[PDB]
Structure formats: structure tokens, C-alpha cells
Amino acid sequence: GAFARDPTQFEERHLKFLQQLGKGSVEMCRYDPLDNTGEVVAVKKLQHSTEEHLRDFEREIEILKSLQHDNIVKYKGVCYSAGRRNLKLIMEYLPYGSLRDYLQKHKERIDHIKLLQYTSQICKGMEYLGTKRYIHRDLATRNILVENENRVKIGDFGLTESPIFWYAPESLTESKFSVASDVWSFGVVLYELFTYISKSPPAEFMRMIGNDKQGQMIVFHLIELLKNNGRLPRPDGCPDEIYMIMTECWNNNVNQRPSFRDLALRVDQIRDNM
Numbered sequence: 001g002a003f004a005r006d007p008t009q010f011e012e013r014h015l016k017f018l019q020q021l022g023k024g025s026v027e028m029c030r031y032d033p034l035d036n037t038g039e040v041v042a043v044k045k046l047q048h049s050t051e052e053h054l055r056d057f058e059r060e061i062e063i064l065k066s067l068q069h070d071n072i073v074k075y076k077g078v079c080y081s082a083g084r085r086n087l088k089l090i091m092e093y094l095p096y097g098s099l100r101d102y103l104q105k106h107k108e109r110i111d112h113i114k115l116l117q118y119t120s121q122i123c124k125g126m127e128y129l130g131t132k133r134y135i136h137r138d139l140a141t142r143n144i145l146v147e148n149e150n151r152v153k154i155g156d157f158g159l160t161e162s163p164i165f166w167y168a169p170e171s172l173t174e175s176k177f178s179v180a181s182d183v184w185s186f187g188v189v190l191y192e193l194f195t196y197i198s199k200s201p202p203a204e205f206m207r208m209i210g211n212d213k214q215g216q217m218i219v220f221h222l223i224e225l226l227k228n229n230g231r232l233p234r235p236d237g238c239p240d241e242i243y244m245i246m247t248e249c250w251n252n253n254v255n256q257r258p259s260f261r262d263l264a265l266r267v268d269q270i271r272d273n274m
């Protein structure tokens with residue numbers, strides 16, 4: 001075919017390393033065509049360009065090329081390094097990293113108003129993803145990124161804490177992923193936000209199932225627990241109205257879950273009613 005993007009836009013010889021960010025692997029770089037200046041960018045690298053992994057990475061790039069929204073990570077381009085025999089993905093750099101880390105490291109600047117702002121922004125990014133007919137699958141605060149104290153953006157690191165504790169029951173039992181299972185996972189993200197102050201979904205589910213359990217037995221008990229209305233508890237200090245949004249997202253009846261449009265409106269109305 002051809003190159004997936006303009007092979008001259010980010011020339012490898014001008015892409016300068018600044019810092020390791022996560023390990024695929026992500027790095028901070030400066031693109032300095034041209035004097036020790038230029039834009040700072042985030043750069044994703046693939047560990048092993050097998051037929052399958054490179055296929056997957058191309059699909060990821062094609063997805064990102066199609067997405068432009070204030071609450072979705074911003075694609076910038078690709079870099080064909082090693083003499084154009086390797087591919088790297090170039091993104092906007094977001095200084096505060098993952099929302100999971102930010103909630104732990106910057107509790108001093110987080111209150112319930114900010115949590116609801118982030119909640120709203122996540123719902124709106126997810127509305128947009130649904131118009132593009134994408135299913136996220138991996139919605140979790142580890143995959144949401146923080147630009148500043150007033151703005152978060154959905155992503156998917158894809159560098160690899162089990163993801164099963166965010167999955168809807170029909171995803172666990174039938175591998176059925178849908179907008180509605182993204183809504184279930186969103187309910188877990190909302191729980192994460194309000195626990196930010198031993199509270200994580202894995203730790204809380206493991207306490208309910210039995211902390212000594214290992215292996216597939218954990219999966220068996222998680223499925224059975226969820227099918228019969230076992231749920232994460234209301235976080236300390238969480239308003240009843242916000243826990244009710246969580247519980248409505250965690251409906252085993254797929255079609256009774258709210259939409260992302262319903263959720264953005266409800267959350268913004270609660271914020272506006274203060």
C-alpha cells in the first residue's frame with residue numbers, strides 16, 4: 001500500500017529522548033527540526049513487531065487517526081525510525097499522566113466538584129467514541145489521562161491490576177463487549193474516582209470473594225457474585241445519588257443500563273444544581 005502517515009512529518013533524527021513514561025513502551029520526546037526547542041510529544045513503541053503485533057498497532061493508529069475530541073487523547077502522527085523499518089506513534093504530551101496516578105499524587109487539589117467534572121468529561125469522550133462505532137473495552141482510570149486540573153482525556157495505554165474487575169458479567173461469561181459493557185466499566189471508573197482517598201476494585205472484590213483464593217477460582221467466584229447482585233460498596237463520603245449512578249450502570253440487564261448521553265446530562269445537572 002503506502003505509509004500509514006506522512007513519513008517526513010516526524011523524522012527520527014530530530015526526535016530527541018527526554019524521559020521514559022511507561023513500560024509496548026511510552027517515552028517523552030522533543031521534536032526539534034530546527035535549536036533545542038520544538039514541541040514535546042509522547043511516543044509509543046512496540047516491543048515485538050510480529051505479524052500480529054504490527055497488525056494490531058496499525059489498527060490502533062487507524063483508530064486514533066479517526067478521533068478528534070476534547071476528551072480523547074490527541075494523535076499527532078507516526079515516525080518511521082530504523083531507516084523506515086520500524087514504526088512509532090506520536091501523541092500529544094499530557095503532563096499529569098494517568099488519572100489513577102493523579103488521584104493518588106494530587107489529592108490536595110481534588111474535591112467532589114472536580115471528580116464530577118472529570119466524570120462528565122469521560123462520559124462525553126465516550127459519547128464521541130460511540131458515534132465512531134468503537135467499543136473501548138478497557139475503560140479504567142489507569143487509561144484516562146490528565147492534561148491539567150480541569151481536563152482529562154480518554155485513552156488506552158495498550159502496554160500490556162487484572163482488567164477482569166472492570167468487565168460486565170456478559171463480557172466475562174460470553175466475551176460480549178458493547179457500548180453497554182463500556183457503561184458497566186464506566187460505573188467502575190466512577191467508583192474509582194470516589195475511592196481516591198485497599199479500596200481499589202481488585203482489592204474490594206478479592207475481599208468479598210475471599211483473599212486466599214488463587215487462579216481461575218477467582219474468576220468463577222467473581223462471575224457468580226456479579227450474577228446474583230454482589231457489588232462494590234458505596235465509598236466513604238460518596239453521596240447516595242452518585243452511588244445510585246454506579247448501581248444503575250451495574251445492571252445485569254444489558255438493555256436497562258443508561259446511555260452515555262443520559263449519564264453526561266445527569267452528571268452535569270447534579271453539578272449545575274449546586
Ligand SMILES: CC(=O)Nc1cc(Oc2ccc3c(c2)CCN3C(=O)Nc2ccc(CN3CCN(C)CC3)c(C(F)(F)F)c2)ncn1
Pocket residue numbers: 021022026042043044060063064067072073089091092093094095096097098129134135136137138145154155156157158
Ligand atoms: C506523564 C505521561 O505519562 N504523559 C502521557 C503519556 C501518554 O502515553 C500514552 C497514552 C495513550 C496512548 C499512547 C501513549 C499511545 C496510544 N495511546 C492510546 O490511548 N491509544 C488508543 C487506542 C485505542 C483507542 C480506542 N480503542 C477502540 C477499540 N478498543 C477495542 C480499544 C480502544 C483509544 C481511545 F480510547 F479512543 F482514546 C486510544 N500520552 C500522553 N501523555
